Amino acid sequence: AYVITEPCIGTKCASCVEVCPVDCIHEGEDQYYIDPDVCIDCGACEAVCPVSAIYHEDFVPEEWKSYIQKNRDFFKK
Ligand code: SF4
Ligand code: SF4
């Protein structure tokens, strides 16, 4: 499962939408948030993101693992 981080935050980007097999990218407001728990781990959204920042949750540095929790949380409750 891959998740967004910091470099994605470019005021309502929307490239990662529609292409995802199960469209598990969501607006909080600022960006499109991937649900790691719905993401079936696939080489689309990251390749589409013109920054290369949608990394595996474990790959995302601890500082930014906060986002993995947020991305989890958003849709869990
Ligand atoms: S394409 Fe990248 S920058 Fe844009 S919303 Fe998605 S993850 Fe963030
Ligand atoms: S990695 Fe694939 S399944 Fe996962 S959020 Fe991205 S496009 Fe959707």
- The CATH number for 68's domain is 3.30.70.20
Cα(53)–Cα(29) distance, integer angstroms: 18
Number of domains the chain is built from = 1
Query: How many DSSP H helices and E strands does the chain contain?
Result: 2, 4
Pocket lined around ligand 2, Cβ cut-off 6 Å: 2, 20-22, 24-25, 34, 39-42, 44-45
Cα(41)–Cα(28) distance, integer angstroms: 21
The beta-strand segments (E) located in 1-77 are 2-3, 25-27, 32-34, 55-56
Measured at the CA of 24, the angle between CA 13 and CA 66, to 5 degrees, comes to 75
Neighbouring residues of 57: CB distance < 8 A, sequence distance ≥ 6: 1, 2, 3, 36, 65, 68
Q: Can you give the C-alpha Rg of the chain in angstroms?
A: 11
- Cα 63 to chain centroid distance, Å, stands at 16
Experimental method: NMR
Select from 32, 33, 54 the residue to mutate for testing ligand 1; criterion: most ligand atoms less than 8 Å from CB: 32
User: Are 33 and 71 within 8 A, CB to CB?
Assistant: yes
User: Are 37 and 70 within 8 A, CB to CB?
Assistant: no
